[PDB]
């Protein structure tokens, strides 16, 4: 979970010339990344990162004088071989 398969989903042990050889090579499981987290008006992301994979999170913080409306953090969910944030970012009311 959190990785997407790149290549064949199976391989057969066929006879290749002088011996038996796997038909297809081993595939690749590349990390699924969530889209760039959203920036919010009057708030920031604490310790913003380059990438965000399955189960990783982003915690927001409202600037001085503003109040947070909503959950502080969201989380990278990876249904279904495509990455998506759990919900919408919080909002900052002045």
């Amino acid at each position: 979970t959190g990785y997407k398969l790149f290549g064949s989903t199976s391989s057969f042990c066929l006879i290749s010339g002088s011996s038996v050889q796997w038909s297809d090579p081993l595939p690749e499981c590349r990390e699924i990344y969530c889209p760039a987290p959203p920036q919010i008006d009057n708030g920031i992301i604490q310790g913003e990162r380059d990438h965000y994979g399955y189960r990783q999170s982003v915690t927001y913080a409202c600037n001085k004088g503003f109040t947070m409306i909503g959950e502080h953090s969201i989380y990278c969910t990876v249904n279904n071989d495509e990455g998506e944030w759990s919900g919408p970012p919080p909002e900052c009311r002045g």
């Binding site: 920036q39 920031i44 992301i45 604490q46 913003e48 409202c62 600037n63 001085k64 004088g65 503003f66």
Partner: protein, 94 residues
């Protein structure tokens, strides 16, 4: 005699809005990225000089806390009441 895209400043994004070519004397201001606040008194902007050369600029953003938390029981005391630069170690009083 037109400057290209401003230089790359770590933790800061120049406010282009949303041009490509900047005529001489064009002053571009950089904005610190989330979880970053401009270090007071430091150069946060550049300018298109003669020779399609942008002025010099370096890192001016330090990591900082969001504006202090709004509480029902207590209010911020000066100068914290108007501050936005809260580098790690900053202590505010209510």
């Amino acid at each position: 005699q037109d400057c290209g895209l401003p230089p790359d400043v770590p933790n800061a994004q120049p406010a282009l809005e949303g041009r490509t070519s900047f005529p001489e004397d064009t002053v571009i201001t950089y904005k610190c990225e989330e979880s970053f606040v401009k270090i007071p008194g430091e150069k946060d902007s550049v300018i298109c000089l003669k020779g399609s050369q942008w002025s010099d600029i370096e890192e001016f953003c330090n990591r900082s806390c969001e504006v202090p938390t709004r509480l029902n029981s207590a209010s911020l005391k000066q100068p914290y009441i108007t501050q936005n630069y809260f580098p790690v170690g900053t202590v505010v009083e209510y």
